[PDB]
Design a protein around this nucleic acid. Structure first.
Ligand code: HIS
Ligand code: HIS
Ligand code: HIS
Ligand code: HIS
Ligand code: HIS
Ligand code: HIS
Ligand code: MG
Ligand code: MG
Ligand code: MG
Ligand code: MG
Ligand code: MG
Ligand code: MG
Lengths: 143, 143, 143, 143, 143, 143
RNA sequence: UUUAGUU
RNA sequence: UUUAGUU
RNA sequence: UUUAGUU
RNA sequence: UUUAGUU
RNA sequence: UUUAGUU
RNA sequence: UUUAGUU
């Protein structure tokens, strides 16, 4: 069962929406990294999250295993952001995002190992400032 | 452009993850609605959000216009929750959700009229307590 | 290249939105079929088009080949009607349709053989009279 | 309920398939605009429809609200045209389209306000003349 | 990099299309599972693969972690089988499948840990013997 | 019913996974062609398969009919390879594939005419050698 | 869990 | 068309 | 509409 | 990787 | 197969 | 925005 005070999803979201909180999360054993990326190319959003996650040590820079888990978690988060077609520029739209990646065990059982959450918050709209509205996305996966 | 203090998406999410914070939102002019629904049938989730939204007065009980806006906002939020196949029971999975619906103008220009946000947060997993992880979804639409 | 006077897609649509215009189409060599179906189950819509198509002789009642072509043509038309999730009842929505199936060669070269078009037109909406709007779909396939 | 002689969907389609009809629609209070666009890039089809709709006055050129409604209506129409993957060039295919955008109240109740329909008709196929077949798409949304 | 003699995907497929080749795979350290399932309900296919996988010991019966990895691997394999809409009965089609689940490390580095492959092969078609053709799907995931 | 020793799907797969077999297939009346393509652009994978199929005579180089059947078969195979989003480069991923196209009648009834199968096998992953795993895809269609 | 099926 | 690739 | 669940 | 943008 | 429907 | 296109 999920540990009520270790909900990796809720935690990554609250962090993202509240502009410290990182040090507290880290003290509790979480691996954390925040970042911002904007683009009309989805691969760039994927790249920033991966680069930030590897440089901040949220995931191993070596091997495929952890990169694979993060890729699919990012994909799941992109579903919430794109809602239907995981396309930006080709569909005449752009995104301005802030992201958070959290890694750790959210379950009561230590045997559940580590899991990872990718959360995205920002705006999506036509490529013209103001013609936009909010967008959110959260992907969760086992590492 | 979006009004920094009126980000309907962010506000509906913060509320969902928390006192009558509703009182404050309502005092500021927002039409608010909170509820909970769990099921293996997506139509039941859609129904609870609609019913609760009409009963609380977040949208007009009469006409199609506002129901239509809410339905699509709900569909968009369901993308973040299902991430790929907007299916539950048929894919051997169930969802336990808490939801919020916020209606109002989030832009600086009052000419933008009302918009509506549907936020979902809970767990999704196999039909067995514990075999689950968090799920999240936000849909925004003009109304 | 497509024969200007034999645009199967356009012709099946015009027929659907209208005298036995069938007589004229049939005199020109087209195998035509018209019908109506309403439901909250997509499989019932697929079944009516198939049954009506076989009974009217638009496709062979024996073998798989022609049934296969029609099934995919129907799937393609269903995309225009559902626009995203080929789901009805499970997404708390219902459809009221009128359909047409036209079979024949729409190209200048007679070597292109027969092709089939499935056209759908009606309304889609919540399970409540009036809370609905139009829906449309066309699928084309070789047969 | 939908007004039988004000079916915005059927009307936009009939207009598109019949090469005047505009003046009659306009006299009845409809905001109308016709256009043609061909491309291997979906954003270009979206751009043409938006530009034509704004220049002809079918939607306000200012604000996001109406642009937002038109964007989603165009997206819905693209589902019928692409059927599965809202991709053209990346999937080695191209489209040659004619489009119509109609705006007005199709319901018996004046309270339903304005709605908008985006209709597309043309051909889709490999990037080689003749290797193609028809394609249709209709998206309907509230403004 | 992937170990030429340990390509889990290829191996699970070859097995599915064939003596206890299981014995050889097991001797090499692979956890293997073979089974068959037919249905018009995708959840029944997912259930048989899971049950058979846990009973045979391919994945842990306890905890969520490994069930989670298998569920997604199964979802991915279902994409190849359904190709578009992960639906069966609701789309008037049925499936007759044979499946294999292979677990182990397919990379040269032992640090990559275990991965899991789900392979499906059988027929898909209308609910009528003979009106069908082959279907195939492979899903791979870290575990 | 499908002829047990003429299963076009299984046959194309076995050929693809076993590095002759072509001459034997050809002697039995099958039209066959093997090839390899790698890219971050899906249209290139589609192009190689089409070019190889036409040059090797698996399908007529003239007319649309057979090109149309092959296009959709390739699309169906790509579902198994991409599983969700038929995108490569835009989603920061690349594929290294080997492909086989088989054409002939797999049914007991000669009246079923010719059918075609497109099979893909290789690896998919981030654009960095080693950070990848296997991927399969099979599409079947009537010609 | 130990291959489905009629409009 | 004659297997791709670094954020 | 006032959180779901076993193959 | 250290928030995008005009048809 | 001979247009659906309430949370 | 004033119908696209070769592997
Ligand atoms: N509203 C679109 C984005 C957009 C494009 N153009 C205008 N807005 C979405 O939901 O993604
Ligand atoms: N983890 C799945 C849900 C699930 C089904 N079975 C186990 N878990 C998801 O992301 O939706
Ligand atoms: N408007 C929805 C249908 C609907 C469901 N509820 C209300 N309307 C659609 O486009 O399919
Ligand atoms: N037939 C494809 C288009 C195409 C691409 N190549 C040949 N035809 C479709 O339905 O979109
Ligand atoms: N041929 C369909 C299945 C089917 C339904 N009806 C006839 N056949 C597919 O590819 O899934
Ligand atoms: N694992 C991804 C490919 C990938 C991209 N980056 C790393 N891997 C897939 O299943 O397609
Ligand atoms: Mg999951
Ligand atoms: Mg939007
Ligand atoms: Mg086609
Ligand atoms: Mg709608
Ligand atoms: Mg993967
Ligand atoms: Mg098929």
């Amino acid at each position: 069962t999920l540990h009520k005070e270790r909900r990796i999803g809720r935690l990554s979201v609250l962090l993202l929406l509240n502009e410290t909180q990182v040090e507290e999360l880290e003290r509790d054993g979480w691996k954390v990294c925040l970042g911002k990326v904007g683009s009309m190319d989805a691969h760039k959003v994927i790249a920033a999250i991966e680069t930030a996650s590897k440089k901040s040590g949220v995931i191993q820079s070596e091997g495929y295993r952890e990169s694979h888990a993060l890729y699919h978690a990012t994909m799941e988060a992109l579903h919430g952001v794109t809602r239907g077609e995981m396309l930006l520029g080709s569909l005449l739209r752009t995104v301005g995002l802030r992201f958070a990646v959290l890694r750790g065990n959210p379950y009561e059982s230590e045997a559940e190992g580590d899991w990872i959450a990718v959360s995205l918050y920002g705006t999506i709209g036509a490529p013209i400032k103001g013609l936009e509205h909010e967008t959110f996305g959260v992907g969760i996966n086992h590492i």
